[PDB]
Amino acid sequence: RSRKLILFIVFLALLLDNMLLTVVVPIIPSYLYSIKHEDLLNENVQVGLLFASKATVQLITNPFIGLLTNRIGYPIPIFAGFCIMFVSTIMFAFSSSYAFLLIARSLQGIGSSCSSVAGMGMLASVYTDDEERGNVMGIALGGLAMGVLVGPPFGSVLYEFVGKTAPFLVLAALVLLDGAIQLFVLQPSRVQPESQKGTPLTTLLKDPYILIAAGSICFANMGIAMLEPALPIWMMETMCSRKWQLGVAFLPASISYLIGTNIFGILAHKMGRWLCALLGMIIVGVSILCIPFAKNIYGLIAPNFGVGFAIGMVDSSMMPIMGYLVDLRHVSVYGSVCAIADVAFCMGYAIGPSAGGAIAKAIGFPWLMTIIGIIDILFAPLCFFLRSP
Ligand SMILES: COC(=O)[C@H]1[C@H]2C[C@@H]3c4[nH]c5cc(OC)ccc5c4CCN3C[C@H]2C[C@@H](OC(=O)c2cc(OC)c(OC)c(OC)c2)[C@@H]1OC
């Protein structure tokens, strides 16, 4: 009856959430191109809306699930989001209709948000010690980040080796194992009238100082959000990739993310968070500019590594400064940093792929990548105001 067990269930829950969020990336455009082979960019823009559907649904849903966890209890909605995730797995596996894909992703968003809120809530509640709670949240988020490293090569290899249905089924089997673990971990379900601070996050979002860092993360991951759906079609077109290099194309970004965060989480505190974020944004800009420069799959290993490393740079700079500013000049509560980070990520993935597809409909991929480079460069100086809050 170890608490580390519940840590394991929540860890694998959000890890599986990201893994399923990510393995869907290099396969759906293949579906759409294959179906349409037997309105050329309408499929691309509807892919962009498909990717943005989860972000929009989660953004709308998060207050509702927060209130629901406040009112009815902690154990019920995690299992509800579990069942939702299982339905999403089955719809990705067996269903092949585009509208079915939109419904599956939109449904998936609710369960993903519900897990990402309520599991963190239990992880904080059971872990009474504040420092212990903080470091366990850190390791849970580290697994959350490592899930998107696991995802893409797994999905691409199982897409090419077996077919269109095998890897979603493997993810579904992982879902069932997770649910068995969750059910066996906790036999009873309690109402859990946990007490929480009444100060909301709308005041935190209203502050420009937090908003600058939130926007920094927003565009920093809007780069990768816009990078997600365009690359597969960009490799089917004028690139003649052999239908499997998608996973090995996205892998360097993830591995660079993990190595950069792991090697700068101890250094950004020493050297300075504001200039660290400044350099991170500059590196995002230059790598994003250089992604069009590559003309072969071998070439893309460098700029993807750069953008992943720089996104890790920005995250390592900006994750602790949220809590620092919140403790300095706002309500001293835990979990609001996670809430503001989540709303920033949802914002970015809401307008990332949608605007990416909208631009790609009439403007080519090179100008898209360059222009988001200009937004990155232009946003870089605004981080200087964060040096002395
Ligand atoms: C898409 O999936 C995501 O959206 C997550 C990742 C996004 C993003 C990403 N996508 C990729 C897709 C690729 O091929 C398609 C290749 C590389 C990447 C990378 C590298 C960079 N990155 C990692 C991922 C980062 C995740 O978020 C957090 O790890 C996080 C961390 C925190 O502290 C560290 C938080 O605060 C305590 C927090 O609040 C909830 C969230 C993020 O949200 C869940």
Author numbering: 17 to 54, 123 to 473
Task: Show me the paper's own sentences about this structure.
Here we present cryo-EM structures of human apo VMAT2 in addition to states bound to serotonin, tetrabenazine, and reserpine.
To capture the cytosol-facing state which was previously proposed to favor RES binding, we used the Y422C mutation (VMAT2YC) which was presumed to weaken the cytosolic gate. We then incubated VMAT2YC with 1 mM RES and determined a 3.7 Å structure (VMAT2YCR) at a cytosol-facing state. This density matches the shape of the multi-ring RES. The RES trimethyoxylbenzoyl group faces the cytosolic space and is positioned nearly perpendicularly to its three adjacent rings in the middle. The tertiary amine on the middle tandem rings established hydrogen bond and salt bridge with Asn305 and Asp399, respectively, as well as a cation–π interaction with Tyr341. At the cytosolic vestibule, the trimethyoxylbenzoyl group brings in the cytosolic halves of the N- and C-domain by engaging with Leu225, Leu228, Met403, Ala425 and Phe429.
